[PDB]
Amino acid sequence: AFARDTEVYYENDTVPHMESIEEMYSKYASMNGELPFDNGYAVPLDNVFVYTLDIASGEIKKTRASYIYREKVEKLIEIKLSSGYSLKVTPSHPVLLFRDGLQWVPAAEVKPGDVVVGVREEVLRRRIISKGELEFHEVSSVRIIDYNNWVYDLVIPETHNFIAPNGLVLHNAQ
Numbered sequence: 001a002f003a004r005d006t007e008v009y010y011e012n013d014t015v016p017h018m019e020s021i022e023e024m025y026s027k028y029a030s031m032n033g034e035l036p037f038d039n040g041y042a043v044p045l046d047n048v049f050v051y052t053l054d055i056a057s058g059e060i061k062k063t064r065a066s067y068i069y070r071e072k073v074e075k076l077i078e079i080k081l082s083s084g085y086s087l088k089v090t091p092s093h094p095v096l097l098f099r100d101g102l103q104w105v106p107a108a109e110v111k112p113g114d115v116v117v118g119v120r121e122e123v124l125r126r127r128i129i130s131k132g133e134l135e136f137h138e139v140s141s142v143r144i145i146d147y148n149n150w151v152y153d154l155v156i157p158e159t160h161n162f163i164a165p166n167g168l169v170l171h172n173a174q
Contacts, residue, residue, distance in 0.1 A: 001071060001151035001174055003088035008154070009124070009165035010065070011049045018125070018165050021152050025068055039174065040071030040150075050154070050162040051124075053134075053169055055102050060131055065162070069153040071174065076147035077107040080140035081116065085166055090151060091144075096161075096169035098136055104171055107142075114139045118167035125165060135167060 004022040011017065017024065028043045035042050044067050052063040079087040079095070087095070087107075094104035098115035105114075116137040123130050153172055156162055160172040 001069075001073070001090045001093065001153045002170070003076065003147065004150055004152065006088065006152070007165055009050065009163070010154075011062075012047055021154075025070070025152065028068055037069070037071075040069065042070075043068040050156070052156065052159045052162055053096075054159075055096075055104075055161070058102070058134070063156055063158045063162075066155045066157050069155055070150050072149070073151050074146060074148050076145050076151070077110070077142065078145050079107060079110060079116075079142050082138040082140050087116075087168065088145070088147070090174065093173040094171040096171070106173075110139065110142060112139050112141050117169050119163065121165065121167035124163075124167055137168070 006021050008021045008024060009018050032044050045065055048065045049062050050065055052061055054061060073090055076088055077091050089107050091108040093107050095107060095110060096117040097103050097105045098117055102117060116139060118135050118137055119133065120135050154162060155172055161170060163169055
């Protein structure tokens, strides 16, 4: 799962949306309602799509999300990038790393200086997106932090992975 402060990208009614995850959560929770879960709460979706990567052939495609989800955590990992951005995520959460191949590694096993997989985040926010490419990013530093707050997951039963507007590739995890 990821922090409520995180920026996100999605599409519905043939148009893109780009805002903080807590803002799209508050929109969908006001439209469709919030349902209970064992470990937290969930919001059901309809015709909501995101960019997803085929890890097998490295091909770019679009997939549906099933529901939004949230739960509570005290302990989170912050990973800083050479771009000046930071990824704030649970110690369990697999990130797409590069070591001779595309590999899913939990933030607790991520170390400073490793390669994160993504795409040009400026190109991802143009009117026409120059498709069929990817971009590698350097980890600046890592640390364990006290969040004590609600964290999200945006669920994809097709592939279990999606891309954020900041270019990075994410896996579904608690």
